[PDB]
């Protein structure tokens, strides 16, 4: 049922980047893992949803 009514979608999990400032607790403006957002992401997983 789910595979039938769903749409193909890329699922990528979220995790806090190591680049977070240890003292303020807020992220670097630019880094490869996360582009200013304080949360990085894992490789995508193909999924129907």
């Amino acid at each position: 049922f789910i595979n039938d009514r769903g749409i193909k979608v890329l699922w990528e999990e979220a995790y806090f980047c190591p680049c977070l400032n240890p003292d303020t607790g807020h992220p670097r403006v630019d880094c490869p893992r996360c582009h200013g957002k304080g949360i990085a992401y894992l490789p995508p997983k193909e999924t129907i949803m």
């Binding site: 190591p18 670097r28 630019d30 880094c31 490869p32």
Partner: protein, 86 residues
């Protein structure tokens, strides 16, 4: 008689040198080509190289220039405790 020893890193940043001219870069243009130079290490186009700032993007064009020699400028402070007897 070093009773104890400790080391600290204050700064760790990259600095570039021209292979032939022997000068250190200080400024670049919009295209990121060198505009100015200095013969002073204390005044250079420092790129941070701490743990968080690795894998930068600001100076990719500068890095690939074969005329430039990157240097890892690192500053340290080391504390040594001596016990010299009576």
């Amino acid at each position: 008689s070093i009773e104890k020893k400790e080391e600290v890193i204050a700064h760790n940043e990259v600095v570039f040198r021209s292979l032939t001219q022997g000068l250190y870069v200080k400024e670049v243009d919009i295209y990121s080509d060198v505009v100015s130079y200095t013969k002073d290490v204390d005044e250079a186009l420092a790129m941070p190289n701490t743990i968080n700032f690795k894998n930068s993007r600001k100076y990719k064009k500068l890095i690939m220039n074969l005329d430039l020699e990157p240097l890892n400028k690192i500053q340290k402070v080391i504390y040594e405790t001596h016990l010299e007897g009576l």
